[PDB]
């Protein structure tokens, strides 16, 4: 039984060819979801679907370094729905993270924090129920 917030440990951090698969369901009347690829107090990759930001559904991605957020990357393609099952897949490549939702490519996020093997945890928070959270080398 996975409960949210959930911290998925990453003993070897992240590396090219690592695929992270997160399966769950969006809670009814969801407000937001967050995936945080963490390196201590820093967030190498923050993936944040917002269901109601000024009456708009938008995905915000960013990096938090030295308690400061960088430039936001915004994506209006929004494959999540309240009360509906989801599958988020994050493929780690040498230059970026590739995110897909329900087997459909969603976005690419270029690495800002290049020490990938230092990302020791994946935090999964927000208005979701979690079925599984796993990683594999593909």
Instruction: State yes or no: 56 annotated in a binding site.
Output: no
Contacts to Br ion by CB under 5 A: 36, 123
Tokens 């769950």, located at residue: 24
Q: Cβ(128)–Cβ(22) under 8 Å? A: no
Q: What is the closest distance, in whole angstroms, from the C-beta atom of residue 62 to ligand TD2 in the complex?
A: 4
Q: Cβ(12)–Cβ(137) under 8 Å? A: no
If the CB atoms of residues 18 and 30 are measured against ligand TD2, the closer one turns out to be 30
CA distance 129 to 107: 23
Q: What is the closest distance, in whole angstroms, from the C-beta atom of residue 5 to Br ion in the complex?
A: 6
Sheet of strand 128-137, all strands in order from the earlier edge strand to the far edge: 104-110, 96-101, 85-92, 18-26, 128-137
* Distance of alpha carbon 104 from the chain centroid: 15
Instruction: State yes or no: 81 annotated in a binding site.
Output: no
Taking alpha carbons only, the member of 36, 83, 32 closest to residue 58 is: 32
Instruction: State yes or no: 71 annotated in a binding site.
Output: yes
Q: What is the closest distance, in whole angstroms, from the C-beta atom of residue 12 to ligand TD2 in the complex?
A: 26
If the CB atoms of residues 19 and 60 are measured against ligand TD2, the closer one turns out to be 60
Q: One symbol per residue from 68 to 107: x for binding ligand TD2 (CB under 6 A), - otherwise; what is it?
A: -x--x-----------------------------------
Site for ligand TD2, rule CB under 6 A? 46, 48, 53-54, 60, 62, 69, 72, 125
């Amino acid at each position: 039984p996975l409960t949210v917030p959930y911290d998925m440990p990453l003993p070897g951090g992240v590396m090219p060819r690592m695929l992270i698969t997160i399966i769950g369901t969006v809670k009814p009347n969801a407000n937001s979801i967050t995936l945080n690829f963490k390196k201590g107090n820093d967030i190498a990759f923050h993936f944040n679907p917002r269901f109601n930001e000024n009456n708009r559904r938008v995905i915000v991605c960013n990096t938090k370094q030295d308690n400061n957020w960088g430039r936001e990357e915004r994506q209006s393609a929004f494959p999540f729905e309240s009360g509906k099952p989801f599958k988020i897949q994050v493929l780690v490549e040498a230059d970026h993270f590739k995110v897909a939702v329900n087997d459909v490519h969603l976005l690419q996020y270029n690495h800002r924090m290049k020490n990938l093997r230092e990302i020791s945890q994946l935090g999964i928070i927000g208005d979701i129920t979690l079925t599984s959270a796993s990683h594999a080398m593909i």
